[PDB]
Amino acid sequence: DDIYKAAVEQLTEEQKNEFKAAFDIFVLGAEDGCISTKELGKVMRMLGQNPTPEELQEMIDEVDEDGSGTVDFDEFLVMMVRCMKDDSKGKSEEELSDLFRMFDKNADGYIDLDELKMMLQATGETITEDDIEELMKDGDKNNDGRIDYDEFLEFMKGVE
Amino acid sequence: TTALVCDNGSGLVKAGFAGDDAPRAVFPSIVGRPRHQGVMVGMGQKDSYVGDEAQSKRGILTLKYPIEHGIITNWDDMEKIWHHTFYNELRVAPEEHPTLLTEAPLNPKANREKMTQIMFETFNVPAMYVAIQAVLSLYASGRTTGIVLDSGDGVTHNVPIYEGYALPHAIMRLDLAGRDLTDYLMKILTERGYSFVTTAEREIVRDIKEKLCYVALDFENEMATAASSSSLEKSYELPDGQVITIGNERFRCPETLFQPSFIGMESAGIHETTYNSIMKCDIDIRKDLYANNVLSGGTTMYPGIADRMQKEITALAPSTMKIKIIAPPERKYSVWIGGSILASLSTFQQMWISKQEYDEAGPSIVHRKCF
Amino acid sequence: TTALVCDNGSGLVKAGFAGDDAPRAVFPSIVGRPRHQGVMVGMGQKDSYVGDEAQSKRGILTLKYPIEHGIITNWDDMEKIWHHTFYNELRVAPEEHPTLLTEAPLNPKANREKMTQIMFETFNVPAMYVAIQAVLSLYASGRTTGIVLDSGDGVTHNVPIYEGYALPHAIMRLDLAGRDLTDYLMKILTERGYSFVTTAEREIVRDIKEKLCYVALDFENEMATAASSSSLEKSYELPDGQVITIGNERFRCPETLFQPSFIGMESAGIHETTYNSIMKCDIDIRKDLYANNVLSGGTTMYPGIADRMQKEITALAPSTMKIKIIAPPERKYSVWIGGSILASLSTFQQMWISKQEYDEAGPSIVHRKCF
Amino acid sequence: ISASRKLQLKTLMLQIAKQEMEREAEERRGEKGRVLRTRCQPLELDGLGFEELQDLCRQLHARVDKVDEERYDVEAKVTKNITEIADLTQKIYDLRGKFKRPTLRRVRISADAMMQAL
Amino acid sequence: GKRQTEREKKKKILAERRKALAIDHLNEDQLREKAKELWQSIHNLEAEKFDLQEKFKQQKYEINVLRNRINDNQ
């Protein structure tokens, strides 16, 4: 998302103090101002913060579509400050339950790959190959063709 | 709408909607309160596990059947079993479905009246009807005559029927059934060293009886063979290891059916109460009853009983008559299949005990014309 | 407010606020009066150093544990230890915090009643609750079944639990624990020339036991190997130099757990009292207890015990059952982590023994419904 | 495995499903209004006699009694459904507590806070 | 039990709900307005009862879902 400006103007000093401490630790001279994410991860790890390290590494392998390799302030700083849990409200459990019920045209207690595919056709989302297997891992936590509203909730909870 | 064909039984409750081939939900009828203290807090421990749930937590429960011999001895537990059957195993509210219970012959009236009063007041069904457990088993065979021996788990009864006209003076009800065979097997297993005492271990002995025991074609020859060779000793693995070996206890447990003197009962076996039930009938329908002897009920599933019984009756009966024993492979659910067929009939649709009729005459309506 | 999860133990007092991962302050429970005369004036010499302060001045003190085997033998010293724990290691006045003590199974009643009377009269807490030390260790593992062997430093007890229902008739409490292993190690070290006698040098022998001893997978093979090669002799530096070399004393000290005949105790080892505790349980929950054997307590931290115990039980148990031994890396504080989890529960919030209840029924309230 | 694209797809699925539910509930409201108009027929009394009013009051009493009895039954059903919902919610909460509550705690709540002052 | 108590509550509801019935005693406009009001009230009652039917059906489906869940716990 493009919440980069929203993030930089939204951060609380409780985490901005650590952000400025890491700014001092990283930027100490002979800095281009881009601030390499590679050293950023190590510095934040040394700071005692506890994010998930591997996901940011995969993102660095993937994010920055322009292929700079050293992400500018916005995206890498967002991933850094992801230690602050400012999510998209997590929606509501009742809303998602109603959604799952609306999808449950089969009325079998679960929504399978076919109903999800029909929903994607309705919204017109791009054909993705992560399908089926994403339902198998998230929805079919028991591998039985059954997915309740908890797997649906945890599938895209707090998506931003 | 569709009718609910429930069948209380004694040992397994079988239920399902009318018009199908097999009962939808079959589960033991046991209600077991926990007996130990319980230290984990917030574990969500209930006060009584009923049905098939108490066959998995039976290690810390005290299972107790609510139906002793056909009759019902503990009405609160039976009400709990019915409530479970309706709401959790079928998930259909009883306010919108007729029910067809089943009852053994020659049972106390108060049992039947209390059953109908419960069904009409607590569960509030639209209409219920009570049928004798043997006529249904005769329906399922597609016959219209024949003498049916319905050896359930609670009580063994033998109702002869001809051309649709039941003979009320020839019903021979005997109280030896599967439960007494389980107790006798549990009592003779002690001759090798295996002691089962707890009410939970009665289930293990029942499993042993189901999986290993068989009815011997000739008793003395089998007793002599098992005492010389060792070709009969079949082993079985308990729920924790320590396999056991059953010797001549295999065919001695179900032999009690043909010699009730083993468990101290005076009466004659199921091979001779059928012949007595036939001989009480009129002299002109004995050939048809001889030719259409029907077996039903769970306990008649022992491997090799349809031959032992035929041999015994052929020994008793006159040499000219042909003795034939109908033993369908779907013996266990024969009563329920017959119940489904009966509930699916159009001619039967006006025999239900409608609720307004009960409101006008009280629970004693069941003994009246609506039988 | 927050609850204080204290855990008296015997050897290390572990305390901390409810809802954390590790105890805030862990320190030995010893109170040592000075024994020499003392000539410097105005040095500020106190009359009793408790806790971790007396492990640094132990050269001129006579340390004496106030808890012998689970039970408390010296109430004044225990009161002093509690006062230190509340005021100096946590710095929270007890007037504003509930407390959750822990107690071994099968302990004398008077000990528990005196404990609650002290907590309510001297420290004047709002509400306190006493819990069995094994149920907490089962909480910490995140299970709800399993048989937990909590081999502390005072007493080793083995409480089996199924589905949250504790089995009070299958608790096997044995009084061999870490302290007896320390004494036996101190007694077998004399076979090389090293004599430790003073109550201060018992701490040095304890450190030797912690850092060097390990449990042998097979005892006879290790005894044969240590008697031929010299690959086992590990050296250790005393608090003043003069390094010592421990030979086959390394695996002979903790072997006492599996052969209590070494220290003259009659009973069977911790490998066989677990199997006996299982066999007293019902026949249908033995598989689950076999598969979920839990280890806890400090003394179960010997390198290589989770394999020796599994080998022994697999030898004893039937060949079909799977034997699994849960040995979490946070074994030492397992009881306290479980205590924190239990105190943090909402369902448990109404089980505390409120002070007004104690005022109405006296100290004997603890044996009542509020257990 | 893309992430930003995954986030966009999930949030757009949420928004589209919400819009579909809103339009479907609007359709349901329209169908309910149609059913109400049919079964509870619209009543016009412009330039009609008083015997019409008497018949209307009679039919009103009859239909009020029958609908109140039916809604009494439906309310009994709703109360039973609410009781079942509360019980099953309690049971699911107990299951989630058994599976997850022991894992819910404040780890390093103060342990990491105090490092070297001692 | 569970047959007259509920019957008694329903009877009481009918008694309190069915007001006094008197028509030919009054002017035509007043009775016409009152009858229209009662018709609209009972029509709104029908609407509410139908919404309750749909909601309780959905909650019954959710109860089936929770039944499947507790079945998955064993």
Ligand SMILES: Nc1ncnc2c1ncn2[C@@H]1O[C@H](COP(=O)(O)OP(=O)(O)O)[C@@H](O)[C@H]1O
């Ligand atoms: N395959 C089997 N072999 C031998 N005995 C069986 C078998 N199945 C069931 N039984 C016995 O029959 C009993 C079940 O009988 P059932 O027909 O269910 O009684 P009911 O008439 O009460 O339904 C069980 O208790 C068991 O002892």
Ligand SMILES: Nc1ncnc2c1ncn2[C@@H]1O[C@H](COP(=O)(O)OP(=O)(O)O)[C@@H](O)[C@H]1O
């Ligand atoms: N790492 C270790 N290796 C071997 N033994 C240990 C180790 N840590 C502690 N012990 C033994 O365990 C005892 C501490 O046990 P603990 O669990 O604190 O007892 P309590 O149940 O009273 O808290 C010490 O006396 C020591 O003998």
Ligand SMILES: [Mg+2]
């Ligand atoms: Mg039967």
Ligand SMILES: [Mg+2]
């Ligand atoms: Mg302990």
